[PDB]
């Protein structure tokens, strides 16, 4: 808590994601960078915005995904895209 | 066979003497040698070989093994076995 009060953002690595095969186990849900938004190049800045939302749309459906194949086309496409971005 | 009805009360009496002698306190205010207090006592309860008895009695007793069995008693507080003396 003291170091979080000094630094300009934190990359959280999660034990559950690492033991699940996702080796670069960055926890997007809570990892943040305060000054870095102004630091990205134009190509990475424009393409990254569409990708962070895809992982957020997956965050709410990931556990439930096994019984989500019979839902509406919107929920199914958001989940299918979320699995590919993950 | 020996019964020590309360080793926890022996530890409390030794803690009192140690604090009154101004010796440095540790966890639960017990002195640094409270483990050695009970260990020095309990390692005497043992079974000794025939050679030990023959050597000790200068050959007066032969072909027999002697022993001291101990049944120490300790009182816990609300089932907490993780306390220092227990």
């Amino acid at each position: 808590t003291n170091v979080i009060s000094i630094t300009d953002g934190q990359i959280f690595l999660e034990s559950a994601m690492f033991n699940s095969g996702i080796r670069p186990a960055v926890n997007a849900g809570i990892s943040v960078s305060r000054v870095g938004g102004a630091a990205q190049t134009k190509i990475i800045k424009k393409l990254s915005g569409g990708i962070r939302t895809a992982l957020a749309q997956y965050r709410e459906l990931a556990a439930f995904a096994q019984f989500a194949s019979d839902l509406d086309e919107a929920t199914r496409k958001q989940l299918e895209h979320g699995q590919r971005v993950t | 066979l020996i019964v020590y009805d309360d080793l926890s009360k022996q530890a409390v009496a030794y803690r009192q003497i140690s604090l009154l002698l101004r010796r440095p306190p540790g966890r639960e205010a017990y002195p640094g040698d409270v483990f050695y207090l009970h260990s020095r006592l309990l390692e005497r309860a043992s079974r000794v070989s025939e050679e030990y008895v023959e050597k000790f009695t200068n050959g007066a007793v032969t072909g027999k093994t002697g022993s001291l069995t101990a049944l120490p008693i300790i009182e816990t507080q609300a089932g907490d076995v993780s306390a220092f003396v227990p």
Binding site: - | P24, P25, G26, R27, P31, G32, D33, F35, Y36, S82
Partner: protein, 116 residues
């Protein structure tokens, strides 16, 4: 270390690494030093490092160590287990359930792990 210097690979067995930590706590209290978190000695990480850093593989030979570990109050976050786990390379877990089936050795292939 003498056997290692003869050009050999050696096994060092430590009956219990928790008792090594406790003996350090007892000596630190006898010397009057100010206690640290959870009542351990202030030198806890240095006393563990001085012992564990000699156990290594060198240009002449090596010392490999098997150390029995006791966990206080079943709390893996306690300073003694936490300081010890920073030096370990593998964890072998023995299961009472596997021994009941007649299998020996009673290692649990799911709970046991290695950095290798």
């Amino acid at each position: 270390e003498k056997f290692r210097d003869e050009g050999r690979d050696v096994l060092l067995f430590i009956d219990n690494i928790y008792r090594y930590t406790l003996a350090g706590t007892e000596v630190s209290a006898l010397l009057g030093r100010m206690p640290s978190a959870v009542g351990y000695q202030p030198t806890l990480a240095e006393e563990m490092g001085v012992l564990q850093e000699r156990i290594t593989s060198t240009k002449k030979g090596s010392i490999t160590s098997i150390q029995a570990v006791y966990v206080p109050a079943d709390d893996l976050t306690d300073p003694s287990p936490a300081t010890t786990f920073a030096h370990l390379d593998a964890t072998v877990v023995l299961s009472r359930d596997i021994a009941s089936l007649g299998i020996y050795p009673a290692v649990d292939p799911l709970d046991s792990t290695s950095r290798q």
